[PDB]
Amino acid sequence: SWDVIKHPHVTEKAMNDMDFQNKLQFAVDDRASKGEVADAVEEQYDVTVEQVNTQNTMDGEKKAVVRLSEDDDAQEVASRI
Amino acid sequence: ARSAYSYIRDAWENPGDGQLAELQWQRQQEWRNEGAVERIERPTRLDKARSQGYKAKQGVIVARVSVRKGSARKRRHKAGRRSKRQGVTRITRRKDIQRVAEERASRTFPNLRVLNSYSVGQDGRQKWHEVILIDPNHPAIQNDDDLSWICADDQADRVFRGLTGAGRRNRGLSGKGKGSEKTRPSLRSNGGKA
Amino acid sequence: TVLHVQEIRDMTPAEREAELDDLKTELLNARAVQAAGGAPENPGRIKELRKAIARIKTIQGEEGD
C-alpha cells in the first residue's frame, strides 16, 4: 500500500516558509488529500498541523505546504532529520 | 399400444386441420405480441422435443423464436457490378430460417448451447421455431449420460459453427455418397462450392 | 544483510510490525537527508532498508501476520 509522505521538499523557498511562516514542505503521494497529509504529518513528527496547501507539480508529484501551530517550531522539527 | 406422444406428432402432420388448426389460429395471436425470443415452460410439441433430446430436467431450456419470411433483405449495389451481380430481389440467403432462429436464441442465452430445434408454424409474414438449449454448466446435465457430451469445451458456440442438426443438413451433409463431394468434411475445405 | 530471515521469523507478529515501522522511519529520514543533498549517505543502507521491508512484509504474509 502507498504511503502519504515521500520526503521533505527542501529548497530555498521551502526554507523561507520554515524560517518565516512555520511551514514544512513535503513531497507527497498525489492520491493524497489535504486531510490525509495533515494526519500523516502529525503522526510522524508529533506536531499539530493548522493548514495544508497542495499542488500537483510538473515533476509528476504532489507538493504540500504544511503550516504548524505556534506550539510547534518548523525549524526544530525539520532540523531533527 | 400407441404412445400418447404419437397423437401430438400425428396432429402436427397437418397443422392446418382439426383442433391443431384452431389452436394455432389462437396462439399466433399471442405469439405475434411476444418478443423475438420467448422462453417457454413447455414444448408446444412434446413428442418432437423429446425425440430431439428434450428432457423434463434442470438445465434444459426451450424458447420460441420468430423470424421474418422470405428472401434476403439486401441493399442494391453502390458501385460497379456486372449484370450477374446487380440482383437484389431474387437473392436468397444460404442459411435457412430455422438456422437463423437457432442463432438468435443462442445469443439470447449466452451461457446455453443449442441442442436442436423444430418448427411450430408460421403466418403470412413470419415463421416460428422452438429451440431446445442446454446449460453445460449445471451438474444435473453434467451427470446425464445422454446429454453431458454437450458440456465439452469443443461444443462451445456449436450453433455458430453449424454443428447443429439443422446446421449440418443445411451444409449439405445428409448424403454420405453422390452429391456430397463438395460438402463433406466441410464447405470451407472444399473451397466454398456447395 | 544486517537483518536476516531467521531473526525475522523468530519475531512475534507484533515485533515485525514494530520492526517494520522502525525501518520505514529509518528510510524516510534517509530519503530526507538525501533530499537535503545530505552527503552523509551510505547507498547500501537506503537500498537494504527497502529489501528489509520487503522481507518482513513477505514473512508477515507467510506467517499470517
Added chain:
Amino acid sequence: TGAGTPSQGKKNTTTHTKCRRCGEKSYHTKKKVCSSCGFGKSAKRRDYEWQSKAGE
C-alpha cells in the same frame, strides 16, 4: 482565401488524443472513439486483414 497556408491558421481545435485503451494519440475527443484501436466503438480491438499483404 487560399485553401493552403492562409487556411492553416484556424487550426487550433483538439480532436485526436492519447487513447486510454491503446496509448496511441488517436482517441477523437469529439467523437469519443479511437481511430486506432476502436475504443469507444468496439469491445473487440480494431483490426483488418488489409493492414498487411493478402498472403501475409
Added chain:
Amino acid sequence: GKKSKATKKRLAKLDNQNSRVPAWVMLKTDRRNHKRRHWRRNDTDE
C-alpha cells in the same frame, strides 16, 4: 488551454525524458539522447 491531472503527469514525464545522458554513463560504457524533443521544433501527443 486547461490541462487535466493526467495530461499534466504526461507532460511532466515528457519533460523528464528530455534530460541528458548523465556524464557517468559515458564513462561507465566507455562511450546521444535519441529522444531530444524541442518545444518549438517538436510536437507532443494529445
Added chain:
Amino acid sequence: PVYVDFDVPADLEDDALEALEVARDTGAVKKGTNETTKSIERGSAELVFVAEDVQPEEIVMHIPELADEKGVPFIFVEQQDDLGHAAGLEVGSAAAAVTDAGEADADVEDIADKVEELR
C-alpha cells in the same frame, strides 16, 4: 378449451376427485397422460380425468374422441395440480385414469352417468 365441449359443475368435480382418491387407496389408478392413454386403448379404463389448464393443449386434445370410440367415460377438472394431488402425486397431472375403482364403483358409475346426462 378446444378439447373441452361441456362444463363440469364444481360439485360434480368434487365428487369426482373424491372418488379418485379412494380409487387409489382401494383400487388402482393410472397417473400421467401416456399411462391414461394406454388404458383407454387397452380398454382397461373405467373412468378418466383430464385437466382444463393444460398448456400446450396438444398433450390432451385426443383424450375426448379416443375415449368416445372406446366407450370409456371421461370427466374434466379445472385445476391440474388437484388431479395430480387427488391421484396421490406430489406434482400435477394433465390426465389420470381410474383403472378399476374400488369402494367407489357405485359413485364412479354414477359420476359417469351424471356426465352422460350432462352430455
Added chain:
RNA sequence: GCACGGAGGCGAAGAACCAUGGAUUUCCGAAUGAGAAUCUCUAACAAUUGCUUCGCGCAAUGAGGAACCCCGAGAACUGAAACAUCUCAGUAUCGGGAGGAACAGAAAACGCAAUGUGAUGUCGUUAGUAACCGCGAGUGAACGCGAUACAGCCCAAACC
C-alpha cells in the same frame, strides 16, 4: 542487468547465477457501481442468461492469440486479345465463432452390377478422364485402387 564511472554495498549466516514452486503485483484495459483521453464520483458479477435457499446466494458469457479451423456476407481490376453468360473466384475483403488442432464419421452408402466393397479425414492415383461451356476462351470431379490410421456407439418409442 545492457553499462567497462564515482561513492558505497552484498557474499562461508554459501551471494551471484539457473530450475521449479510461492509472495507482491499501481492505473487504464473484455473492463463489469457510475462517469472520464490512464482520472474521478458515491457499495456494486454492468449487461445477458441458467440454477435458485428467488438473496448476485451458486454459476456462465464477454476479450486475446502467428497462422491454421468452422459457419455466414461476397467484389473488381484481369482473361475471353472488344464484351454481356463465362473467367479472375467463392478469390480479396467483411460479419460470427471453436480448438490445440478444427471439421467429418459408423450408410435411407457404393453400383469395377457383384456369389462384390463396407464409418470418416488425409496422401498417391484414377485424370485434365466423366461432366460443364457465347460448346468460345476456359472450367473440372467421383467410384475404385495403393497407402496412412483405425473403433465403434448413445437416444426417441414400444414394454415398465
Added chain:
RNA sequence: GCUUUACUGCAGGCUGUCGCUGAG
C-alpha cells in the same frame, strides 16, 4: 464523367395471381 427512342440488365411504380384468409 455525361446523354439518349444504342445493347444488356438492375432498383422503383402500377397491375393479376398465391400465402396470411375466415362465416353466409
